[PDB]
PDB file of all heavy atoms in Angstrom:
ATOM      1  N   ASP A   1      21.139   4.141 -11.998  1.00 16.52           N
ATOM      2  CA  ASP A   1      21.250   4.845 -13.271  1.00 16.52           C
ATOM      3  C   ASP A   1      22.580   5.566 -13.328  1.00 16.52           C
ATOM      4  O   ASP A   1      23.233   5.525 -14.438  1.00 16.52           O
ATOM      5  CB  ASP A   1      20.076   5.816 -13.375  1.00 16.52           C
ATOM      6  CG  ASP A   1      19.611   6.282 -14.714  1.00 16.52           C
ATOM      7  OD1 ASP A   1      20.262   5.924 -15.708  1.00 16.52           O
ATOM      8  OD2 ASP A   1      18.548   6.992 -14.720  1.00 16.52           O
ATOM      9  N   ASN A   2      23.087   6.167 -12.266  1.00 20.11           N
ATOM     10  CA  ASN A   2      24.410   6.799 -12.285  1.00 20.11           C
ATOM     11  C   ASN A   2      25.498   5.764 -12.406  1.00 20.11           C
ATOM     12  O   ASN A   2      26.510   6.042 -13.120  1.00 20.11           O
ATOM     13  CB  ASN A   2      24.632   7.571 -11.013  1.00 20.11           C
ATOM     14  CG  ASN A   2      23.909   8.881 -10.986  1.00 20.11           C
ATOM     15  OD1 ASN A   2      23.818   9.559 -12.033  1.00 20.11           O
ATOM     16  ND2 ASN A   2      23.441   9.289  -9.801  1.00 20.11           N
ATOM     17  N   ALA A   3      25.392   4.581 -11.842  1.00 22.51           N
ATOM     18  CA  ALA A   3      26.436   3.547 -11.902  1.00 22.51           C
ATOM     19  C   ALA A   3      26.472   2.850 -13.241  1.00 22.51           C
ATOM     20  O   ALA A   3      27.514   2.249 -13.564  1.00 22.51           O
ATOM     21  CB  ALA A   3      26.253   2.540 -10.796  1.00 22.51           C
ATOM     22  N   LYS A   4      25.382   2.847 -13.959  1.00 22.87           N
ATOM     23  CA  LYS A   4      25.105   1.858 -15.036  1.00 22.87           C
ATOM     24  C   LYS A   4      26.274   1.781 -16.009  1.00 22.87           C
ATOM     25  O   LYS A   4      26.772   0.655 -16.297  1.00 22.87           O
ATOM     26  CB  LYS A   4      23.802   2.235 -15.748  1.00 22.87           C
ATOM     27  CG  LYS A   4      23.148   1.121 -16.545  1.00 22.87           C
ATOM     28  CD  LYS A   4      21.610   1.198 -16.617  1.00 22.87           C
ATOM     29  N   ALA A   5      26.661   2.912 -16.530  1.00 24.08           N
ATOM     30  CA  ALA A   5      27.618   2.947 -17.650  1.00 24.08           C
ATOM     31  C   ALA A   5      28.939   2.349 -17.168  1.00 24.08           C
ATOM     32  O   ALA A   5      29.714   1.873 -18.057  1.00 24.08           O
ATOM     33  CB  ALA A   5      27.760   4.361 -18.143  1.00 24.08           C
ATOM     34  N   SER A   6      29.291   2.400 -15.895  1.00 22.02           N
ATOM     35  CA  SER A   6      30.554   1.879 -15.333  1.00 22.02           C
ATOM     36  C   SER A   6      30.469   0.390 -15.038  1.00 22.02           C
ATOM     37  O   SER A   6      31.472  -0.248 -14.902  1.00 22.02           O
ATOM     38  CB  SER A   6      30.938   2.586 -14.136  1.00 22.02           C
ATOM     39  OG  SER A   6      31.007   3.964 -14.450  1.00 22.02           O
ATOM     40  N   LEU A   7      29.266  -0.154 -14.944  1.00 22.33           N
ATOM     41  CA  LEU A   7      29.120  -1.562 -14.549  1.00 22.33           C
ATOM     42  C   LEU A   7      29.593  -2.527 -15.616  1.00 22.33           C
ATOM     43  O   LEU A   7      29.416  -2.244 -16.839  1.00 22.33           O
ATOM     44  CB  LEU A   7      27.647  -1.843 -14.247  1.00 22.33           C
ATOM     45  CG  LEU A   7      27.089  -1.099 -13.057  1.00 22.33           C
ATOM     46  CD1 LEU A   7      25.615  -1.416 -12.885  1.00 22.33           C
ATOM     47  CD2 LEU A   7      27.812  -1.452 -11.796  1.00 22.33           C
ATOM     48  N   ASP A   8      30.023  -3.683 -15.221  1.00 20.16           N
ATOM     49  CA  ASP A   8      30.408  -4.700 -16.206  1.00 20.16           C
ATOM     50  C   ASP A   8      29.222  -5.097 -17.058  1.00 20.16           C
ATOM     51  O   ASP A   8      29.374  -5.363 -18.287  1.00 20.16           O
ATOM     52  CB  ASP A   8      30.956  -5.905 -15.503  1.00 20.16           C
ATOM     53  CG  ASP A   8      32.333  -5.697 -14.870  1.00 20.16           C
ATOM     54  OD1 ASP A   8      32.875  -4.568 -15.007  1.00 20.16           O
ATOM     55  OD2 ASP A   8      32.781  -6.664 -14.236  1.00 20.16           O
ATOM     56  N   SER A   9      28.021  -5.130 -16.511  1.00 20.18           N
ATOM     57  CA  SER A   9      26.747  -5.461 -17.178  1.00 20.18           C
ATOM     58  C   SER A   9      25.710  -4.541 -16.551  1.00 20.18           C
ATOM     59  O   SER A   9      25.785  -4.334 -15.300  1.00 20.18           O
ATOM     60  CB  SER A   9      26.435  -6.917 -16.973  1.00 20.18           C
ATOM     61  OG  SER A   9      25.250  -7.335 -17.653  1.00 20.18           O
ATOM     62  N   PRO A  10      24.761  -3.987 -17.296  1.00 17.17           N
ATOM     63  CA  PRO A  10      23.845  -2.990 -16.759  1.00 17.17           C
ATOM     64  C   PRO A  10      22.668  -3.609 -15.997  1.00 17.17           C
ATOM     65  O   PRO A  10      21.497  -3.458 -16.348  1.00 17.17           O
ATOM     66  CB  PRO A  10      23.400  -2.273 -18.033  1.00 17.17           C
ATOM     67  CG  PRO A  10      23.357  -3.375 -19.048  1.00 17.17           C
ATOM     68  CD  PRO A  10      24.585  -4.192 -18.761  1.00 17.17           C
ATOM     69  N   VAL A  11      22.996  -4.234 -14.883  1.00 18.54           N
ATOM     70  CA  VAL A  11      22.048  -5.076 -14.135  1.00 18.54           C
ATOM     71  C   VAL A  11      22.295  -4.901 -12.654  1.00 18.54           C
ATOM     72  O   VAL A  11      23.421  -4.596 -12.209  1.00 18.54           O
ATOM     73  CB  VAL A  11      22.196  -6.551 -14.485  1.00 18.54           C
ATOM     74  CG1 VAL A  11      21.997  -6.823 -15.954  1.00 18.54           C
ATOM     75  CG2 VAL A  11      23.487  -7.167 -14.015  1.00 18.54           C
ATOM     76  N   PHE A  12      21.269  -5.181 -11.861  1.00 19.49           N
ATOM     77  CA  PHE A  12      21.481  -5.480 -10.454  1.00 19.49           C
ATOM     78  C   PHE A  12      20.570  -6.652 -10.114  1.00 19.49           C
ATOM     79  O   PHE A  12      19.616  -6.942 -10.849  1.00 19.49           O
ATOM     80  CB  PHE A  12      21.256  -4.270  -9.531  1.00 19.49           C
ATOM     81  CG  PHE A  12      19.836  -3.773  -9.463  1.00 19.49           C
ATOM     82  CD1 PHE A  12      18.956  -4.271  -8.491  1.00 19.49           C
ATOM     83  CD2 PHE A  12      19.377  -2.779 -10.283  1.00 19.49           C
ATOM     84  CE1 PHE A  12      17.632  -3.813  -8.423  1.00 19.49           C
ATOM     85  CE2 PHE A  12      18.079  -2.323 -10.186  1.00 19.49           C
ATOM     86  CZ  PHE A  12      17.204  -2.832  -9.267  1.00 19.49           C
ATOM     87  N   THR A  13      20.906  -7.348  -9.048  1.00 13.87           N
ATOM     88  CA  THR A  13      20.132  -8.537  -8.658  1.00 13.87           C
ATOM     89  C   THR A  13      19.786  -8.431  -7.201  1.00 13.87           C
ATOM     90  O   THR A  13      20.532  -7.876  -6.370  1.00 13.87           O
ATOM     91  CB  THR A  13      20.890  -9.840  -8.931  1.00 13.87           C
ATOM     92  OG1 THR A  13      22.083  -9.929  -8.122  1.00 13.87           O
ATOM     93  CG2 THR A  13      21.338  -9.933 -10.353  1.00 13.87           C
ATOM     94  N   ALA A  14      18.591  -8.918  -6.894  1.00 17.43           N
ATOM     95  CA  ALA A  14      18.067  -9.016  -5.541  1.00 17.43           C
ATOM     96  C   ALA A  14      17.957 -10.458  -5.165  1.00 17.43           C
ATOM     97  O   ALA A  14      17.240 -11.223  -5.822  1.00 17.43           O
ATOM     98  CB  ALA A  14      16.730  -8.335  -5.397  1.00 17.43           C
ATOM     99  N   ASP A  15      18.557 -10.835  -4.064  1.00 14.63           N
ATOM    100  CA  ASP A  15      18.563 -12.189  -3.537  1.00 14.63           C
ATOM    101  C   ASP A  15      18.200 -12.093  -2.088  1.00 14.63           C
ATOM    102  O   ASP A  15      19.094 -12.140  -1.205  1.00 14.63           O
ATOM    103  CB  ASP A  15      19.896 -12.874  -3.788  1.00 14.63           C
ATOM    104  CG  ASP A  15      20.011 -14.264  -3.305  1.00 14.63           C
ATOM    105  OD1 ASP A  15      18.998 -14.872  -2.914  1.00 14.63           O
ATOM    106  OD2 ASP A  15      21.173 -14.774  -3.325  1.00 14.63           O
ATOM    107  N   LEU A  16      16.936 -11.921  -1.778  1.00 15.85           N
ATOM    108  CA  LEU A  16      16.491 -11.667  -0.411  1.00 15.85           C
ATOM    109  C   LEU A  16      16.370 -12.982   0.326  1.00 15.85           C
ATOM    110  O   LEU A  16      15.864 -13.963  -0.224  1.00 15.85           O
ATOM    111  CB  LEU A  16      15.161 -10.941  -0.389  1.00 15.85           C
ATOM    112  CG  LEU A  16      15.139  -9.597  -1.110  1.00 15.85           C
ATOM    113  CD1 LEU A  16      13.774  -8.959  -1.022  1.00 15.85           C
ATOM    114  CD2 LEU A  16      16.127  -8.633  -0.545  1.00 15.85           C
ATOM    115  N   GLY A  17      16.727 -12.997   1.585  1.00 20.07           N
ATOM    116  CA  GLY A  17      16.613 -14.192   2.411  1.00 20.07           C
ATOM    117  C   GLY A  17      15.289 -14.305   3.113  1.00 20.07           C
ATOM    118  O   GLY A  17      14.672 -13.332   3.445  1.00 20.07           O
ATOM    119  N   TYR A  18      14.889 -15.516   3.438  1.00 18.81           N
ATOM    120  CA  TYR A  18      13.777 -15.809   4.342  1.00 18.81           C
ATOM    121  C   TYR A  18      14.353 -15.950   5.728  1.00 18.81           C
ATOM    122  O   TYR A  18      15.110 -16.901   5.987  1.00 18.81           O
ATOM    123  CB  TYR A  18      13.027 -17.063   3.911  1.00 18.81           C
ATOM    124  CG  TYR A  18      12.042 -17.544   4.940  1.00 18.81           C
ATOM    125  CD1 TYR A  18      10.940 -16.820   5.302  1.00 18.81           C
ATOM    126  CD2 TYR A  18      12.268 -18.768   5.561  1.00 18.81           C
ATOM    127  CE1 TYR A  18      10.044 -17.304   6.255  1.00 18.81           C
ATOM    128  CE2 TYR A  18      11.378 -19.258   6.507  1.00 18.81           C
ATOM    129  CZ  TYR A  18      10.293 -18.506   6.855  1.00 18.81           C
ATOM    130  OH  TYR A  18       9.420 -18.961   7.840  1.00 18.81           O
ATOM    131  N   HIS A  19      14.022 -15.000   6.568  1.00 15.15           N
ATOM    132  CA  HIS A  19      14.521 -14.990   7.953  1.00 15.15           C
ATOM    133  C   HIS A  19      16.023 -15.154   7.947  1.00 15.15           C
ATOM    134  O   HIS A  19      16.585 -15.786   8.853  1.00 15.15           O
ATOM    135  CB  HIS A  19      13.771 -16.065   8.789  1.00 15.15           C
ATOM    136  CG  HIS A  19      12.308 -15.791   8.955  1.00 15.15           C
ATOM    137  ND1 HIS A  19      11.448 -16.722   9.591  1.00 15.15           N
ATOM    138  CD2 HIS A  19      11.537 -14.770   8.609  1.00 15.15           C
ATOM    139  CE1 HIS A  19      10.260 -16.206   9.620  1.00 15.15           C
ATOM    140  NE2 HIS A  19      10.213 -15.087   8.963  1.00 15.15           N
ATOM    141  N   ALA A  20      16.731 -14.484   7.025  1.00 15.70           N
ATOM    142  CA  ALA A  20      18.172 -14.652   6.884  1.00 15.70           C
ATOM    143  C   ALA A  20      18.655 -13.515   6.016  1.00 15.70           C
ATOM    144  O   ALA A  20      17.906 -12.971   5.206  1.00 15.70           O
ATOM    145  CB  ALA A  20      18.524 -15.962   6.247  1.00 15.70           C
ATOM    146  N   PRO A  21      19.941 -13.200   6.076  1.00 14.44           N
ATOM    147  CA  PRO A  21      20.520 -12.212   5.158  1.00 14.44           C
ATOM    148  C   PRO A  21      20.529 -12.735   3.736  1.00 14.44           C
ATOM    149  O   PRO A  21      20.435 -13.917   3.441  1.00 14.44           O
ATOM    150  CB  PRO A  21      21.939 -11.978   5.696  1.00 14.44           C
ATOM    151  CG  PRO A  21      21.900 -12.438   7.134  1.00 14.44           C
ATOM    152  CD  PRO A  21      20.920 -13.590   7.109  1.00 14.44           C
ATOM    153  N   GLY A  22      20.628 -11.783   2.815  1.00 16.98           N
ATOM    154  CA  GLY A  22      20.722 -12.016   1.381  1.00 16.98           C
ATOM    155  C   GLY A  22      21.691 -11.029   0.785  1.00 16.98           C
ATOM    156  O   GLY A  22      22.512 -10.442   1.490  1.00 16.98           O
ATOM    157  N   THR A  23      21.561 -10.791  -0.508  1.00 14.22           N
ATOM    158  CA  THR A  23      22.536 -10.028  -1.263  1.00 14.22           C
ATOM    159  C   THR A  23      21.892  -9.156  -2.328  1.00 14.22           C
ATOM    160  O   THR A  23      21.031  -9.656  -3.067  1.00 14.22           O
ATOM    161  CB  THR A  23      23.531 -10.990  -1.912  1.00 14.22           C
ATOM    162  OG1 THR A  23      24.075 -11.866  -0.943  1.00 14.22           O
ATOM    163  CG2 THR A  23      24.661 -10.299  -2.621  1.00 14.22           C
ATOM    164  N   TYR A  24      22.418  -7.956  -2.467  1.00 13.68           N
ATOM    165  CA  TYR A  24      22.231  -7.126  -3.656  1.00 13.68           C
ATOM    166  C   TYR A  24      23.562  -7.083  -4.369  1.00 13.68           C
ATOM    167  O   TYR A  24      24.556  -6.599  -3.823  1.00 13.68           O
ATOM    168  CB  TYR A  24      21.762  -5.711  -3.331  1.00 13.68           C
ATOM    169  CG  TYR A  24      20.316  -5.568  -2.966  1.00 13.68           C
ATOM    170  CD1 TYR A  24      19.894  -5.477  -1.657  1.00 13.68           C
ATOM    171  CD2 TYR A  24      19.372  -5.538  -3.971  1.00 13.68           C
ATOM    172  CE1 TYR A  24      18.548  -5.336  -1.316  1.00 13.68           C
ATOM    173  CE2 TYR A  24      18.045  -5.403  -3.638  1.00 13.68           C
ATOM    174  CZ  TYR A  24      17.628  -5.339  -2.335  1.00 13.68           C
ATOM    175  OH  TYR A  24      16.276  -5.235  -2.053  1.00 13.68           O
ATOM    176  N   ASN A  25      23.546  -7.439  -5.646  1.00 17.51           N
ATOM    177  CA  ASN A  25      24.722  -7.316  -6.506  1.00 17.51           C
ATOM    178  C   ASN A  25      24.453  -6.331  -7.614  1.00 17.51           C
ATOM    179  O   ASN A  25      23.333  -6.251  -8.132  1.00 17.51           O
ATOM    180  CB  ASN A  25      25.105  -8.663  -7.139  1.00 17.51           C
ATOM    181  CG  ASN A  25      25.636  -9.651  -6.148  1.00 17.51           C
ATOM    182  OD1 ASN A  25      26.259  -9.220  -5.158  1.00 17.51           O
ATOM    183  ND2 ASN A  25      25.448 -10.919  -6.373  1.00 17.51           N
ATOM    184  N   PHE A  26      25.481  -5.592  -7.993  1.00 15.57           N
ATOM    185  CA  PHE A  26      25.409  -4.631  -9.084  1.00 15.57           C
ATOM    186  C   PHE A  26      26.459  -4.980 -10.099  1.00 15.57           C
ATOM    187  O   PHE A  26      27.661  -5.143  -9.794  1.00 15.57           O
ATOM    188  CB  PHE A  26      25.704  -3.216  -8.582  1.00 15.57           C
ATOM    189  CG  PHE A  26      24.609  -2.717  -7.695  1.00 15.57           C
ATOM    190  CD1 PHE A  26      24.571  -3.045  -6.349  1.00 15.57           C
ATOM    191  CD2 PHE A  26      23.593  -1.940  -8.208  1.00 15.57           C
ATOM    192  CE1 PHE A  26      23.497  -2.652  -5.556  1.00 15.57           C
ATOM    193  CE2 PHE A  26      22.538  -1.535  -7.392  1.00 15.57           C
ATOM    194  CZ  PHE A  26      22.517  -1.850  -6.083  1.00 15.57           C
TER     195      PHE A  26
END
């Protein structure tokens, strides 16, 4: 919520891995 207004798009994404690393993007 504090980042939102500065973001290119007001979103974040969760890409969790199965027995592996993944990514959070904002």
